[PDB]
Amino acid sequence: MILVMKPYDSLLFREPRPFDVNNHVARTILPLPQTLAGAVRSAIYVKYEPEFEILGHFFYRYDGKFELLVESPHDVTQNLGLVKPHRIDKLGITILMDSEGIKFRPFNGFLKFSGLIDYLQGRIAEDSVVERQKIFKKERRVGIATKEEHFYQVEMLRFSDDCGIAVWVEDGVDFDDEGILGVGGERRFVKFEKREEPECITNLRSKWKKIRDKINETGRLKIYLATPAILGAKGYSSKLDYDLLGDIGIERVRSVNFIGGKPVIFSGWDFVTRKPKPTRYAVPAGSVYFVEFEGEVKLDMPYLKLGKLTKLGYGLCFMGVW
RNA sequence: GAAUGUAGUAUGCGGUCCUUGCGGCUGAGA
C-alpha cells in the first residue's frame, strides 16, 4: 500500500550538523527513510525496528496521471547514456564504459517506474527522466526570529504544487486513510492519504520474470539502490559482502563493480534512552552494483532488502540486467 | 526531537524668451 504524503507547506529535514543558537544557518537534505518510518509509526500508533516493514519511499508527481519518481541512477550519464563496466584482460583492470569516452557525469534527476521497467533492460527513453527542478526547489527562509542575534536562516524543500512524497508499505497493516501528521525539522506537517498500490508496480511485478530470466541466462546482474542501505557487517562498509548475494541463490561471484557517490552520514534520537542514536554510514541511493554471478537467482520479487534497518525503508534494491 | 528596533524622496529651480489688433474704405449724393 502506497502512502501519499502531500506537504501543505515546505519541509526541512535536519542534517547532522547541530543548529540551536550558533549554527543559525540550517540546510536541508533529502528525507532519510528513518524519518518517514517514524512518521508512519506515529500514524499507525495514532490509528490503533517496527514489527511492520516499509519497503521504501519515492517522490511522485500527480498531473492527471499519478506516477512515482525514483531517484536518478548513478548508471546514467548526463546525456541519457548508460554506463557499462567492461574488463580489459590485457591490462588486468575493469573500467566503466559509456561508449562515448572514459569520463562521464551522472545525470541528476529522477526516473519513473516506466523508466524502471525499461531501464532494467539496459535502455532509457527520454520521457523516462525528470529533472530535479520539476519536483522540488530549495526555498531558503531567512530572518525568522534580547533577540538581536536570533535571526537564523533555514533552507526547506519547496515541492511543486503537483509533487509530493510517497511511502511504499507492504500489503496489509492497514490504518487511517486520510489525515495529517508532522514530518521534518522545524514543526511542519503533510496531508497524507492512503491509496491502492499503483498500476506501475504491477506493471513491473508482472514483467519481473522476463528480466529475471534474462539475468539468469546472460550471467550478468546489476543491483540498483532505490533507498540508501547500511551494508556493513561489523562496522559500515561499501564493499558488497558476497554472502549477501548468497541469499538470492548466487553460487559464486566473479567480479563486483560498484559506482556511487559520497556516503550519507546520519543518526537519530533514541526516545527510549533520550540519547542520540549511534552514527551510521550508508551507501547513497542511486548507486548500482555490477556483479558477475555464477548460478541463478530464485527471487520471486523484483526487489530485495539489503543491510540493516530494512524495516524502516533502507536497502531497497532492484535486480537488473546489463 | 523540542527549543526586530530606529528612518520626512527630500535639498536647490521664475512658464520664460521673441510677436504694432494691424490691413482696405470720400460724411458724401441733389
Side-chain angles (χ1 to χ4, degrees), chain A residues 1-46 48-64 66 68-89 91-97 99 101-104 106-133 135-146 148-160 163-198 200-233 235-246 248-250 252-261 263-273 276-293 295-297 302-322:
Chain A
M1 289 218 107
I2 209 52
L3 215 55
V4 187
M5 289 186 357
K6 187 259 292 307
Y8 157 88
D9 196 39
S10 66
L11 290 167
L12 167 147
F13 298 95
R14 284 292 293 103
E15 86 162 7
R17 188 171 324 249
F19 144 67
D20 46 355
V21 191
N22 38 358
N23 332 299
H24 30 288
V25 277
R27 264 92 68 76
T28 169
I29 73 180
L30 279 306
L32 280 156
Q34 53 174 42
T35 293
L36 272 36
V40 173
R41 283 185 324 158
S42 105
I44 175 60
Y45 169 56
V46 163
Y48 306 91
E49 271 182 287
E51 86 276 326
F52 78 119
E53 151 154 52
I54 300 184
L55 301 190
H57 71 94
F58 352 85
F59 295 58
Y60 92 98
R61 179 175 57 186
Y62 201 172
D63 37 10
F66 154 72
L68 317 93
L69 267 70
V70 137
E71 156 83 15
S72 77
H74 276 301
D75 209 26
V76 167
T77 58
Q78 74 255 64
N79 325 63
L80 280 91
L82 280 99
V83 191
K84 214 183 294 202
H86 86 84
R87 95 161 317 290
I88 296 177
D89 345 50
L91 306 183
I93 45 87
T94 313
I95 72 182
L96 270 294
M97 203 79 159
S99 82
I102 43 57
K103 253 188 213 195
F104 72 102
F107 153 73
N108 56 354
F110 287 101
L111 172 88
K112 334 181 165 149
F113 259 37
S114 14
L116 214 72
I117 191 53
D118 68 65
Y119 157 82
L120 289 198
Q121 325 274 35
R123 95 203 50 88
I124 45 174
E126 196 32 283
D127 72 327
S128 286
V129 306
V130 193
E131 238 283 347
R132 282 220 181 287
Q133 322 300 92
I135 301 310
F136 69 86
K137 311 230 219 192
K138 244 54 165 306
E139 158 185 3
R140 40 175 307 218
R141 329 197 145 162
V142 72
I144 276 167
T146 354
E148 76 275 65
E149 92 298 320
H150 189 226
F151 308 132
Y152 69 96
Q153 301 95 300
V154 133
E155 306 198 14
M156 296 220 168
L157 253 56
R158 184 46 95 166
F159 276 48
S160 283
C163 312
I165 282 184
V167 159
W168 197 10
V169 180
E170 107 290 343
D171 337 337
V173 295
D174 44 301
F175 73 118
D176 161 49
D177 309 22
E178 208 283 277
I180 145 199
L181 55 162
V183 180
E186 300 218 300
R187 317 207 64 220
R188 307 261 55 97
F189 54 98
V190 323
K191 176 204 172 162
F192 91 127
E193 199 197 349
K194 172 154 94 177
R195 173 187 322 278
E196 195 33 76
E197 180 116 17
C200 316
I201 283 54
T202 97
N203 159 347
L204 195 127
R205 263 182 186 196
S206 96
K207 220 177 281 178
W208 168 229
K209 277 311 291 322
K210 163 177 176 198
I211 313 146
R212 192 241 286 248
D213 65 58
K214 189 134 48 152
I215 290 153
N216 261 352
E217 66 92 6
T218 201
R220 311 134 83 78
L221 157 72
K222 96 168 142 188
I223 290 188
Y224 167 67
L225 302 179
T227 87
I230 52 197
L231 284 203
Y236 302 99
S237 185
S238 38
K239 175 248 181 210
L240 176 48
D241 157 45
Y242 296 161
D243 177 16
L244 272 161
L245 318 93
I248 18 157
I250 292 321
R252 198 197 35 117
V253 293
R254 291 176 229 151
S255 87
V256 173
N257 283 249
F258 141 81
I259 165 65
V264 302
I265 322 181
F266 69 100
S267 57
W269 195 272
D270 200 340
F271 274 39
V272 183
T273 95
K277 286 193 250 165
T279 166
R280 302 203 176 80
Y281 300 82
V283 281
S287 313
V288 283
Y289 279 82
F290 291 111
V291 305
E292 320 266 33
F293 68 104
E296 74 113 1
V297 279
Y303 48 83
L304 74 187
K305 314 293 301 196
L306 294 197
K308 341 187 185 108
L309 302 183
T310 118
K311 321 191 105 174
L312 307 188
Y314 289 79
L316 181 49
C317 320
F318 294 110
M319 278 84 111
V321 88
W322 54 301

